[PDB]
């Protein structure tokens, strides 16, 4: 799961989608025209998307990366540094632990909060 986790991390902290083998949920078009459709590969999900709680989590993860994607595009930068916010997020180095319950949601919430912190600073200042 180590690379999977890395891929997830970058999605959530950088807004980077990089999936050459099509293993990640959240794929889009093109590879202007920024309002593209995102697709959820139900079949590669870690959890079902039938419960309300997991749907909400999936969407939060999705939004997190999108806001970051917007910021990277807006600032014309390859990456958003940790010092861009007061929220710094560690890498996922233990998948099994992340999947132990509650930890995933919080990890994502931190990522999400950070994405909004950065995003909003841009929108209300930039």
């Amino acid at each position: 799961s180590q690379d999977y986790c890395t891929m997830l991390y970058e999605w959530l902290t950088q807004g980077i989608l990089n999936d050459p083998y099509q293993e990640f949920m959240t794929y889009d078009d093109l590879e202007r025209a920024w309002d593209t459709q995102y697709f959820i590969r139900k079949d590669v999900l870690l959890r079902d998307c039938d419960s309300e709680e997991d749907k909400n989590l999936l969407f939060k993860m999705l939004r997190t990366g999108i806001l970051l994607k917007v910021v990277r595009a807006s600032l014309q930068i390859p990456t958003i540094p940790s010092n861009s916010s007061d929220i710094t997020i560690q890498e996922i180095n233990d998948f099994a632990d992340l999947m132990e319950g509650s930890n995933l949601e919080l990890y994502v919430d931190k990522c999400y909060s950070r994405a909004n912190e950065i995003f909003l600073k841009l929108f209300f200042q930039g």
């Binding site: 600032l75 014309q76 540094p81 861009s84 600073k121 930039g126």
Partner: protein
């Protein structure tokens, strides 16, 4: 400061992404060689794109009652 494109349908398009202000979280629109040539070609093309000069094409309406390209009559 806004680079705006006017479209024939009235749309004013910002030419690209709206950039942030100088205040950020952390130049001149000059032309290059091809761009200069392009502007010039565009210009001459535009002169000759006016309907009255399209004498080399079936697209020119050949007058209406005379049946001829406007320059024939002119």
């Amino acid at each position: 400061q806004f680079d705006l494109i006017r479209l024939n349908n009235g749309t004013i398009e910002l030419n690209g992404i709206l950039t942030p202000k100088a205040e950020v979280l952390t130049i001149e629109k000059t032309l290059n060689i091809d761009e200069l040539e392009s502007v010039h070609n565009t210009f001459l093309t535009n002169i000759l794109s006016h309907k009255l000069f399209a004498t080399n094409t079936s697209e020119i309406s050949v007058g209406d009652y005379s049946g001829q390209p406007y320059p024939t009559s002119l």
